[PDB]
Structure formats: C-alpha cells, structure tokens
Ligand binder design. Sequence first.
Ligand SMILES: CCCCCCCC/C=C\CCCCCCCC(=O)O[C@H](COC(=O)CCCCCCC/C=C/CCCCCCCC)COP(=O)(O)OCCN
Ligand SMILES: CCCCCCCCCCCC(=O)SCCNC(=O)CCNC(=O)[C@H](O)C(C)(C)COP(=O)(O)O
Lengths: 459, 110, 88, 274, 128, 104, 70, 124, 175, 63, 178, 84
Amino acid sequence: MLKIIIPTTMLLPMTWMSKHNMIWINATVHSLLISLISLSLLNQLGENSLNFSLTFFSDSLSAPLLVLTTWLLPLMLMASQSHLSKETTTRKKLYITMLILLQLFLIMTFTATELILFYILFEATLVPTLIIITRWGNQTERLNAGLYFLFYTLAGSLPLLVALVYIQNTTGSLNFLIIHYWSHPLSNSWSNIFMWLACIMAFMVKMPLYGLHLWLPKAHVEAPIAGSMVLAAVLLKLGGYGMMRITTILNPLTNYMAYPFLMLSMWGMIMTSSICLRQTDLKSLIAYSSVSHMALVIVAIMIQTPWSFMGATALMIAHGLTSSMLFCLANTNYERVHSRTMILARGLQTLLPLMATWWLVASLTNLALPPSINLIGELFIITASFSWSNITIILMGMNMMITALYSLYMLITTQRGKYTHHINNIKPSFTRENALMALHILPLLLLTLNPKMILGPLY
Amino acid sequence: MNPFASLTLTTLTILTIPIMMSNSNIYKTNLYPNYVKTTVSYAFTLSLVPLLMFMHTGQEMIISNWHWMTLQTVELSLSFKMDYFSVMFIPVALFVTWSIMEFSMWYMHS
Amino acid sequence: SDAPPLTLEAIKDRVLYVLKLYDKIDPEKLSVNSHFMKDLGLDSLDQVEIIMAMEDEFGFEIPDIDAEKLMCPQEIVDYIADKKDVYE
Amino acid sequence: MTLCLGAITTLFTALCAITQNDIKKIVAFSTSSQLGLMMVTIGINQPHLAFLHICMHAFFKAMLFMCSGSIIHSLNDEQDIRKMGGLYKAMPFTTTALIIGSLALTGMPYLTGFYSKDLIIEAVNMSYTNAWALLMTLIATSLTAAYSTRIIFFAFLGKPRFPPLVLINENNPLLINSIKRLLIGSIFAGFIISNNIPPMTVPNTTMPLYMKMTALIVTIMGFMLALELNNTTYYLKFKYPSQTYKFSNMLGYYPSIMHRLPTYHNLSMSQKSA
Amino acid sequence: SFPKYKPSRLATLPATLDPAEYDISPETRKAQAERLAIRSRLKREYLLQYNDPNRLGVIEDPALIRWTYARSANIYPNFRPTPKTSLLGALFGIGPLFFWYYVFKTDRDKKEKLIQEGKLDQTFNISY
Amino acid sequence: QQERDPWYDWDHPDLRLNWGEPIHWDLDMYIRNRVDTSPTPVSWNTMCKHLFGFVAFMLFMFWVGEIYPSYQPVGPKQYPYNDLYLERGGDPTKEPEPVVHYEI
Amino acid sequence: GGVHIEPRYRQFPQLTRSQLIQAEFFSATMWFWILWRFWHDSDAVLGHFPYPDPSQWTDEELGILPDDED
Amino acid sequence: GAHLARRYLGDASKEPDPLRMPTFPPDYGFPERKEREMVATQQEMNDAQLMLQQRDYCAHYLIQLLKCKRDSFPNFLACKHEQHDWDYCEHLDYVKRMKEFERERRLLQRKKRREQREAEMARG
Amino acid sequence: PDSWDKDVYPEPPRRTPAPAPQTSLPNPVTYLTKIFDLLVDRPVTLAREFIEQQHAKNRYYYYHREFRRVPDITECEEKDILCMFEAEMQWRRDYKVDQEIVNIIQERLKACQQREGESYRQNCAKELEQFTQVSKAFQDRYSDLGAHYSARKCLAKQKQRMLAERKAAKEAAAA
Amino acid sequence: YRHSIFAVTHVLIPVWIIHYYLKYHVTAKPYTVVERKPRIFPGDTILETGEVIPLMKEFPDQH
Amino acid sequence: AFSAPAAYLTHQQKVLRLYKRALRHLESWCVHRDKYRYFACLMRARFDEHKNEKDMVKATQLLRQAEEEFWYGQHPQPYIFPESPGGTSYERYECYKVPEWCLDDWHPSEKAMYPDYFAKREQWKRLRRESWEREVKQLQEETPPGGPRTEALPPARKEGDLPPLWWHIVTRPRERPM
Amino acid sequence: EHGHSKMELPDYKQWKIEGTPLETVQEKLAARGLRDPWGRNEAWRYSGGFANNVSFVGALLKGFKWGFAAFVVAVGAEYYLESQ
Ligand SMILES: CCCCCCCC/C=C\CCCCCCCC(=O)O[C@H](COC(=O)CCCCCCC/C=C/CCCCCCCC)COP(=O)(O)OCCN
Ligand SMILES: CCCCCCCCCCCC(=O)SCCNC(=O)CCNC(=O)[C@H](O)C(C)(C)COP(=O)(O)O
C-alpha cells in the first residue's frame, strides 16, 4: 500500500521544486501515473482481504473508492487550470498542495485497519477542503459555508471519539478484523441506544441525511470547481464507507433503531427531488440531486442485506462520477456567463453542439438509463427495499419519475429553445474542457462492461 | 450448423454497422441515408430466411451467448429468444422501417 | 420544400391581381400607389377584409397592429417582402 | 382489467378522433384505438390474434401516415383538413393508396385488416366477457368507419381550399416505390401470413347468422351515418355546436385539467413546503 | 343572453371580457401612459446597451438579480415565527414521516407475525 | 407566461419577457413548458363536471356489466383425460377422482 | 430524382401519365383480388356450418320424460 | 342472445347458470349413457404437443392438419381437406355443447314445474 | 462436446423425423441452407482447423486447485483466533460452492423448460422437484444471515433450528 | 460492384464471425444454445434411431 | 410586431379586431367557400348596422355583448396558419437561426474560405462603428427630457446618418436560414 | 436546378361567378339586399378541372371496372381449364 502513499507524498516536493510554468503538466502526468499504479488494487479475492501490513489493508469495498480518489486528482487539476490563470506561483503551488494533501488523507482513510486511525484521518480531511472553500472562493458567503461545513461534521464526529474509545476500553481492540471476528450482539439498553446514536450520527451527518443536509448546498455553491468536484465525488462517500464498516457491531439493535432514519431518507429522497424541480441555480439543483441519491444510499445501508450493500457501492461510484461531470459542465457555463443562474444562458445547443452531447450523456447517466451502473445500483437497492417491505416501491417509483423530470429539465432549459440575444461572449469550447468530459464519461460506460469490480465485497 | 441462430444474430449485428461508421467519412457526405437504407433492406432480406425455416418446421431457440455477471444464485447473461413472435415481428418491422426510410429520403431532403 | 424564390415583381403582381378581383374597387382607378380611404373611398372594414384576402392569398397572417397601418398596396408589398426576406 | 381498459381506451380514442381536424392527430387517435382493440383481444385470452393484428396494423397504419405526410409536403406543410379540398384527381396515387389503407383498416373482407379485425370481433362476441366491453368495441368499430369516411370526404372529395399557388407533385420515384411496397403488403400480406402460420387457437366454426355479420353491419352503419352527417355541411345553415360535440373536441377535457391541476399542485409545493 | 363563463385560478378571465377595461377615466389613461412611459424608458436603455459595438459581455439585468436573491437568500431575514407558519411547518415536516412510519411498522409487524406463525410460503425466496 | 402577447417585440422572445421588468415570483412555474393559465372555451367547473361524470358513469357501467355478463348457449368445454389432469400440474402418484364427460 | 413541374396559379396541376396508370392499375388489382377471394373463399364471410336451432330438437334426444316418471 | 334477457329480466332460477353447470346427474335423462371416445393417445398427443387447450376430443384432425402443413411446406394451400375436417369436428363439439345447454334448460323447466305442481297439490 | 460432463447436464436423445416431401415443389429452405454451408460453414471450419493446429503446435496445461479440509467452527475455542479464521475461510468457500450448485440446478430447469416446448408443465416435473429441494436446503442453510454473515451466525441459526425440531419431536412423542 | 462489395463487407464478414463465435465458443459451454424439441407426428421416422411411430386408431372418417 | 404599441386601444381598433377574429372563426366553422362567403356577407350586414351610432355610452355597451356571444360560440379548435403563434410550425426554424457574432470566433482556416463575404463583413463592421458613434449623439439630442414617452425610434435626418439602433434589426439571421 | 421559369399569371377577367354555387350565394344575398364583395375571387376554385366532383361511393369504387373485367377473364379461363 506504501507504493501508492509514497508517490502521493513525493508529489509535494515535485510541485514545490517545479518550474513556474510547468506545475500543471508534471502534476497531471504523475497523478495519472499514480492512478495507473493504483489500478492494481482492483484484483480482489473472495476471501477476507489483502492485508498489506498491521496498519493498512484493502478490500473489495475500499478498492473502487481508492481508484476513484486517485483518478479524481488529474481531473481536478484540469478543471482548476482555467480560473487560476492570474494567480501567483506560490499560491498555485499552495492550491496544488492542498489537493495533494486531501488525496493523501483520503487514501490513508480508505485503508485504515484501525478505527481510531480512520477517525483521525477522516477528521484531518476537513482542513484542506475548508481552506480550499474559504480561501479560493468567489462569493462572500464562503466563510459561512466553511463554518457550516466544519461545525456540522465536528458536532457529529465528537461523540464518535468517545464511542470509539469506550469500545476499545471494553472490548479491547479497534482493529477491524478482530472487531468482525469477536463481534457480539448488543443488548436492548439505553446505554446501547446512545452508543448506537454516537456511532451512527457522525457518518450520517456527512452523507448527508435529510434534515442534516443544510450545509451541502452552501458548501457546493460557494466552493470552487475542484472543491465541488472532490466533495461531490469522494467526500460524500466517507459517511457510507463508515457506516458500512461500523454496522458490524451495532446488531441486533439496528433492526429497530433504523426506523427514524429510514423514513427521513424515504421521504427525503422524494422531497429534495421535488426541490430540484424549482431551482434557479444549476449548482443548487445538482447538490439537491446528490442529497436525494445519498438518501437512497442511506436506505440501502440501513436495510443491511447483501443486495442492498452491492447496490449502495455501485450507486456511490456512479453518483460520484456523474455528479463530478455535471459540476464540470456547470462550471464551463459559468466561466462563459459568470452568472450561475439557469435562465440566463439558453439555447446553448445551437452554439456548442459537442457540449450539448456531453450534457445529454450526463443527464442520461443521472436519469439512470440502462445498462449504466447507476441503474444497476438503483435497481438493486429498489429490489432489496421491496423485499424489506412491498410498499416502499411506491415512494421509490415516484422518486425515479421525478428524477427523470428534473434531469431533462436541466437539459431542456439550458440547451434547447432560442438563444439569449445579449450574450455574445460564448467562445467555442476548448479542447481541455472536452477532454475533461470524455475522461469523465468513458470510465462509466467502461465500468458498465465489468460491474463486478464495483459491487463490493458481498458480490 | 443450424443457420437459424447465425442468421438471426447476423441481422441484429449488421443493423449496427452504420452506427459504428457514424464517425467515418461517409457520415459527412450526402450518401449516408442511402447507405443506411441499403443496410436496412439487406437486413430485412437476410431476416426473411429464419422466418421461412420456422414456417417449414417450427424452429424455436434460446441463445445465451455472453454471461454478464452472477449474483449469488442469480445469473444474468446476454440471452436472445427467437420464438415465433420474434422471427415474425422482425421481418415486418424491417420492411416497415425500410419503407419509412425510403420515404424520409424524400420528405426530409431540405 | 421546393418553393420557388418569389420576387418583388411577383408579390406586386399577386397583390394587384387580388385587388382587381375586388369588384368594389375599379380596376382602372387602382394603382400601385393608390390609397384606399381617400383615392378609392373605401371603409375601414374594407381595409380589414382586404388584409384578410391578402393573408389567405399568401398563406401567412399579418398581426393586427401591423395590418391596421397598412393603407396602400406599395407598403403592403413592402411589408410582405420584409417579412419573407426576398432580395429583388 | 385488461379487457375493460382496452374497451375504454378504444372507445374514448375513437370518440376523440371523430371530430378532430388535424390529419396527423386523427391518425394518432386511430392508432390509439387499434392498440385498445389489441388490448381487448389480450383480455379475452387470444394472444396470437393480437400479434396478428399487430402485424397487419403495422402495414396499413404506416401506409396511411406516409400518404398523409405526402399530402402535407405537397400542400406546403399544411396539416389542417379545412384548407385542403379536392385531391382525388390532383394526386391520384396518394388517393388510391389512402383509399386502400382505409378499406383495410375498416375491415374490408379479404384484405390485410380483415384476417385480424374480423376474428377479433368474432372472438369478443363469442366469449364469457363483459357486455359493456362488447358494446364498446362495436361502437368503436362504427366510429372507426366514421372517422375513415371523415378523412376521405374532407381530404379528397370536395372542392380545393388551398392557396392559389399550386405546388402539387408526386412524381418522385422514392415516394412512389415506398408507398407501393406497403400497398402490395396491405393487399396480400394478411392472406399470406394467415395461410402460412400454423393454427394457434380453437376456431369459431359455427355462428348465428346475425352475429357473424355484426362487424360488417356496424361498419356499413358507421359509413352511412358518417356520410349523411358530413353531407349536411353543404347546407346554408349555421348552428352552434352541441355540448356533446365540444366534449369530444377537447378530448374529454382530459388534457386540460390533467395537465393543469396536478402539475401546479405539485410545483407550488416544491417551492413552498419543499 | 348566453351562458356565463366562470374564470378560475387555472383558467383566467379573457382580457376582452373584463368590465374594468370599459370603465374609462382620465386617471386610467394617465396610468396607462405612465406604464408605457416606464416600459419605453427601460426598452430605450436596454437597446442602447445592446446595440453598442463596444460591449462584448452580458447585459446585467437588475430584475433577474433581484428575483434570484429574493428566491434564495431573502427568506430567513423576513421570516417571523407565526402560528400559521409554525402549524404548516409542523404538519408538512412531521405528519408524512410518522404516517409512513406507521404504515411500514404495521406492514412489517404483520409480515413478522405471519413468519412466526409459519403461514407465508417463502419457497424459492433465496435472494434478499 | 403563455398568454402574454405573442406579437410584442420582447427582448426574450421565447420566455416573452422584457429586460428590466419585474419578474413573477413563480416565473419558473409558467415558462410555456409547464402549467399555464390561458383562458379556455369552456369554463373550468363545467369541464371538471363533465369528465368526472363520464369516468364515474364508465366505471359504474363496467361494474354493472361485470354483474350482468354475456355468453353463449353452450355447456362447459370437455377435456378427455380427467380434465387433462396429467398434463396440467401432474402428480401421477395420487389417482384423482375420475371425471367422465356426457355424450349427447 | 423527379422531373420539373412548374406551378400553375389557379390552374389544375399537370399529371404524369405514369402516376395515373399506376394508381388505376393498383385500384384494379385490389378490386380483382377482393372479387377473386370472395369467389373462391365464400365461407370466410358467410360462414360454412349452419347454426342449429335448439328449440327444434325433439325431447327424445334431450332426455326429457313426459313429466311424470321423475 | 335472447337467453340473456330471459335470465336478467325474467326469472333467474328459471334458467341454469353456466358457472355451476351441470346441476343434474348424467343418468337422470336416460340410462343409455354412451361414453365419448378419443382417437389420439396420451404419448402421441404429447409428442405432437399441440397445446393444453388444443388437446381436445377433435385432436386427431388437428394432428393430421399439422402433418399436412409440415409436409407440403412450399404450397401453403394444399391440404385444405384436413382443415375442413378439423373445423367440422369443432362444429360437432359446439353443437354438442348447445345440446347440453338445451337439455339442462328443459330439465330445470321440468324440475320447477314439479315443484309448482307438488306445491299446488299440497295446498289442495 | 467433451468440454462439459454429460451426466451433470443430462439431455434427451431428441430424435428427429426424416424429411417426407408430399409435393413436387422444391422448398427454398434446402437451397438456402445448402448455399449457407457452401458460403459460411466451409471457410469457418477451415479457419478453425488452422487455429486448432496452431494451438496444437504449443500445448501447456493448467490445474484445478485442491483445498485440504480444516476444522470448522463447531470445534473452535471461544477466543482462539487462528482456528476461527480457518473455519471462516472454509465456511465461505463452502458457501460459494453451494451457490454454484444452485446455479447448476437453475440452468437445468431453464433448459428443460425451453426444450420441452409447450409440454413443459408435465415434462419437467423432475427438474422442478430437484430445484424445490435444493432451494429449500439453501434457504435453510443461508437465509436471513444478513450483510455481515459469518460462520457463528449460521451455527446459531442451525442450533436454534435443532432446538425447534427437538422440542416439536418431544412434544409429538409425548402428545 | 458497390452492391457486391456491400454484400461482402456488410453481410459475409459479420455472418462468418458470428458463425465461428457461436459454433466454437458459445456452444462449448452447456445449455447456452438450446433448441425446441421438434414435433413428432404419427408415421414419422427418426434419423438417429430408425424406429417408426405406429399409426393412429383409424378414426371413423365421414364428411 | 414591427410597429411600436400604443398606451391604449381605441374603440374603433377594438371593433376592427372583433370583426377580424369573428370572421376568421366563422370561416373555420363554415368549411366550404361559398357558405363562408354567404355567412360573411351576412356577418358584415349585422356588423355595420350600428356604424352611425353617436353616443359613447351605447357604443361601449355594444361590442361587449358581442364579445360575450363570440366567446360562447368561438369554435374551440380554430384554423391557425402554420407559422402563426399557435400553428404547427410556429418555431420550427428557431434552431437554425444563428447570430452573426459567432463568425468572429471562426478559425482563420475557416475564414480562408469565403474571403469576399468576410471582407464585406469587415466593411459592415466599420460602417456600424462610425454610425453608432453618430447615433448616440443623435438620440440624446433628440429625446425629450425625463425619458422617452413611447418606444418609437426616429429615422435618420442628415446625409450620411443611419437610423438609430439599426444593426440588430437589419442583421436578422433569416426566416429560413437552413 | 430549381424552378426558375418566370411563371405568368392568367388574366383577372377570366374568372366569372356564374355557373358556381357562388351564383346561388349572391342570389340569396340579393334576396336580402346584400351582395358579396369577394365572390369573383374564389371562382377559380370551381372553374378548371376542379369543376367536377366524385361521390364517396364512386371514390371508393375507383378501379372496379377494370378489376371486374380481369376477374371475369380469369374466372372464365379457370372454368375452361379446370373443366378438362
Ligand atoms: C448533528 C449533531 C449530532 C451530534 C451527535 C448526536 C448524537 C449524540 C450521542 C449521545 C451523546 C453521548 C454519547 C456517549 C458515547 C457512547 C458511550 C456509551 O454509550 O456508554 C454508555 C454511556 O452512555 C451515556 O452516558 C450517554 C449519556 C448522554 C450524555 C450526553 C447527552 C447528549 C444529548 C443526548 C440527546 C441527543 C442524542 C441524539 C441527537 C440526534 C442529533 C440531533 C454506557 O456507559 P456506562 O455508564 O459505563 O454503562 C452503564 C452500565 N454500568
Ligand atoms: C361566430 C362569431 C360571432 C361573433 C358575432 C359578433 C357580433 C357582431 C355584431 C356587432 C355589432 C357592432 O358592430 S357594435 C356597434 C358599436 N358602435 C359603433 O360601431 C359606432 C361607430 N362605428 C365605428 O366607429 C366603426 O369603426 C365603423 C364606423 C363601422 C368602421 O369605421 P372605419 O372602418 O371607417 O374606420
């Protein structure tokens, strides 16, 4: 596992010793090389895991997330290359350093043999993204967004530290292998109920759960493109990964403690989707769609069945890729219009046809069209919920319907109709943006050919 | 062996060639509509044979060729059913589509 | 489509042709520059019916605000030429 | 449930198509009525008959749409039937193709639509099913004949009503060949397919005489009543439309309220509560 | 005399049937004149900014900015806890949750009772 | 937004808005691609009453026809080998109660 | 791929003899087919097997006794 | 159907209900009771594998018709005689069903007449 | 084909009746099939023979991995972690094996249904019975374990099943 | 010439590839390609075994 | 469309519009031409009876009952021309309309094609550049103080002067560009 | 290659209202003292080849004569060949 961590750490001296006009080239090249190296982790076993050492290990659940995290950084660099043109070399190096540190923290977070180390790195990731949002942010509300994003997560995660140290003092270890092998049932007690709440709330606040999702539209609107990319693709999956790992010790309490949350998601995935129908901002619309998808993932995790787990993993990967693509598209529009409103730039398919094709493919992926992995995860979770209770389908069906609607809404308002007359600074699309979209979309349709790589360890 | 399966899969296979050629040079000329129409007509006249074989005997087949994945006890594979309904509806649909595309080569000239 | 590119001469010829089919106005008295209310002594309802006939002849309908101030054949031909973008 | 849904679908769509004025909308409602009839066939447990009707409807409905589109292209993108008159002599091939397609659609015997629709009528009339559904499909067949007559009368028989500039022309080999291929199909394919496929259901060999011809009887009844009603438009009498007629024109007011009441009541909530 | 047309929220009264347009006073004419005057001033300024060859950007529309700000960020500072808002919020945010909870709890309890009683016929139910 | 004047030279012809004019709070609700409040030839209440009556009468008549069905003067269909017991389901080691059909 | 036909301006459009003869030929073919089929296959419309009248059947074959035995 | 009107406008008990038909023993009419015959056996019907609803008393003509259809394939209109025989056998089965319908109808008539006559005799 | 075992995937003789032309008209099916062989089946067979001989020029083998039986969870101490690990791995391998067994039975059932045609309801009773038995066994073994399934949970389920069976048997005997 | 090159490059090559793939790879595994059992009628003969189906029960033929 | 609107609608203009709309809907009702002509002359006969009415009160009371009666008998599916705001091809070609300014972004390789067109385009650009500078001053000196009272534009009055705000009216894409 | 032939219009005096239903229309109009102002405009609609109409039954019965003759010939040949 060190063969991935060490080059990521070496990315920092490379960036700081690079020429004043070559930082982007070397950063992108070596990030892509690190992604190629990390591709080896996909080789998994039907047995326990690949236990590299006493400190790190990999699984069929950590492997897709690690590969996605390593693949993200070149895309973030290409996205951030444009709007940082008038920046001093030292500050560009600081920005690249923040991105590299965030990737390193996520890489060592997703392996994490021991729960306290996982918590340490999972809380360490809060700093680079907070600095990115509050420093390289366009609007004056970036400070409030940073405060919200920091304090929601810290309030959720502070009881988790107490719960984890209490676990280590009682059972004796926090190593995940020993935790799984020496697992014992949880008695129905008030102490155990608060134990469950402390262990669960920290991850459920970052998914985000409906009603605890107020921070996400703010942190998405006020962040730069790289911040929105990283927080929509991987940083949302930290909560899902945490719940998937930690639920092994919460049984059989979860059978009846999950009821308040399931409802909050089952209704919430509807409500936010309806919110997407009436939105004047592209970024807010995509943020609310992300909230809906992550609510469905929460339902899948709380159901706690094999099909639920595989569907949740596939949905996490697919949602990350699609959300990053959509935010790239929105940022490309913003860099031309500088407005970030839906109704100003209209009829863009007349002006940018290939970008219209990219919009169509992104919307179709978000619409969960077969045989894309989005639909694979969605269908697996829907079937598992149907087995959980035959009535759930109703809500599920409604959400699916509404989903398609708003997706096509986002496709029709921005690309069809009559172009706005007074916007004439719509330059033809660069090769950089088109390459970014192609590198976003081709992995999705390639993963569609081999779903077993993203179906988790329960495949 | 058993040309039923080969021809039934060949019709669908050759129906997709102009989609792959959509990035080639023929897509940038005015001969593409005739190319697609000719491909459709060839597909129809090729598909006419399995229907004849069924009419003579009553041949029915399932072709499970590509195994997509396996989910515990469930197995999802690329399977085509070529019973009476399929081998009868394919020629009719291809004939109708050929007529429609020949008409559209006139209707949508501008 | 296969629609021939009609010209100003064609449009003026059609307008005068339909105007000559109007029995209420004399074929000899009418000119390309002849006014309806004063040079021909017509009514406002006559003008709106003439606009109706032009609309029916040429297949497109003129909005009321534009038609109410279309008082002479030459400006009718000019309006139709501007609307249909005919060169010569 | 399948039988009832098919019956309501076919009658509602035929009722709507009765008074429509756009040719494309009329043929769309005809297709919806045919689909409802196929669902009715599904309801009475006759799947192979429904498949056969699928095959026949393909042919004649495709030809009808092709002829309609040829007329629109010949009349400078004009779709309304009020502004199209005597095309029977101005464009003969389209007229004869539409006539043959309408005959096949209405169940003219020994044509493509005969071998399917006649057997549908026979089987629905000789099964333990709903009486309301049976009445519904009979009225639907009558209305099918009626709107086919409406199309022919208002599109080919009267005096021309298009703008003086005549651009009528069919002399294009592509259109002629495409129409004639499906025309040969709609003449012969029904007989060929019916005589070639193996038997798939127990036939109805013995029928009461009045029930045997009920399809033809309702067909000619619809033809005569529709022709009589369309003949009165020549009269110099102007009367305001009846309440029943208005209901038929606005498609039972289903598109209005169902596209105004629910959507609003959703979107407002999506802004207010959500 | 003919049957009256009753306008509704989703089907408004036609402009030709409004009695208000027939009640004409010099005040109404003055109001319409100043309405068209402000409309003409806005159109003049928009066209002046639009036809200038020097401009190569997006004409900033203050109305659009105001609409977006009012839709997004002007809600809470103008929000006051009232019995109407409190009651509507409590209903729309708590009622559906407890209703779905009751529905699903009843369904799952019935299913569990049937399973314990053994009368469910779960044959071939392998994937869950 | 649908019922606005279609002949005015708006700055935004598709949305039929003018630059600088106040924007409706629910503009995205009426964009001509969504709910519209244009006047209709028939009043709203009359249309609702007519459609509701038509559908309710249709459902009632379908239920009545279910109560009073239509059939033919025939007896039940006769199948040879004990209503085809062996080929319908099977269970060949049970010897069901034989059923013989009446020849007339 | 067709020929040149100019507009007419209130004059009936010229019709190529080819389309005339093709339309007439196909109408004649349709009518000939209908007539031939009705001649050869008349039972497809008028039926083949007569419908028996149940009331005309005698009580002997229907198992009816003269109302007294049982 | 007329029977529908006679049932739903007249006396419901006057006429039999096809759902529960037959309501009388088969020997109530006459003691002859000849048994209907089958030509095709189980194994050859299963090999011919017509359909479950097509495996009726007329299945031998259907088997012959399928043999003709498979044999003279190119001339799809050769073996018309066998279709005629199959249709004739179906027609015979249908008239047997109508004879059944009439027989139970008149048996119900005579049973009701017996109920009425016995009631009248008891009253007197 | 020797690529698979015939006994694991049993198939019927499927004898086919010889052609018996009744009329003199030549059926186009035979001409079409003969031209199909002449134009497709010969070059394909030639290329396959070429590829097969090329493969024969260089032959090498691969073997099926054998696994030794290890003590299971029922003979494992409470906190002894090594034998627990071995038992868990063995149980997981067994689980995969039973899943493949159920897969084989399901494939058999599907093939029977398609092969027997419209006599499937009577001609596939044996396969239906085998699938019912295997499904019941698999459901008893592995159902309701959860996402975090393990050997101890399966053992606990089996033990409570034996409790139920023993209590019912004692009650019936003492009834 | 265009029609011939079309029939070669658009029909013959795909059918060759499909025939090879189905004949030597798809059929290599069991139950992938499964066929409906051909109908058996009385009086037929079987190529594989050679036995003849006995005729039927000589039904009474009339009309 | 081209004509600037007025602050209000006169009674004469309103009655003309009612006549136009009623005649169109009657034509829609009476399909055949001769019947349409008969009922149209009848409509004109019932229309001009109150032509010579004098007082405003009765005239305003009229044209109101007429509007209500028309609303009741308005033929809920009228005939609409294909390019009309309700026709079958109202905005069919709006997807082929492309602004002129996009030609400023063409690659020099593409600009190599069509050289005469682009030379003329630069000539038009220079003409617009001068005429705009003239037009700003002409409009500010021409406008009444306190803002314009109507959206009507004055024409050019000098020799080399061009009409104010002409660029985006003259350079419309086309009616049917492709 | 398009339609550039310089088409010329007919003369306006050719169209005459008599002989068309517009005659009955103007007679009825004069019966109430009214007159059509646009009657001659649509007269071309009834003048040329459009002056002749076809009934619905005739339209349906478009090619029955030739088909009936062909059927007679075919059935005669069939009768003379089968009776051999
Ligand atoms: C978005 C903000 C969310 C913030 C997190 C919300 C969840 C809060 C979790 C509860 C807080 C305390 C957790 C304690 C850590 C777990 C350790 C544990 O469970 O051990 C228990 C100890 O349990 C406790 O002491 C918990 C007492 C709670 C004290 C603090 C109360 C905080 C507020 C509680 C209500 C809110 C919780 C849910 C909020 C939902 C989010 C809004 C047993 O200890 P013993 O005494 O040794 O065993 C007794 C037998 N000899
Ligand atoms: C099916 C549709 C039914 C609709 C029927 C509607 C009812 C129609 C009857 C309406 C009756 C009236 O006119 S209501 C009568 C209202 N009062 C007047 O008309 C008095 C002065 N008339 C004018 O000024 C006009 O414009 C005029 C002088 C005619 C023109 O003038 P010019 O041209 O010189 O400009």
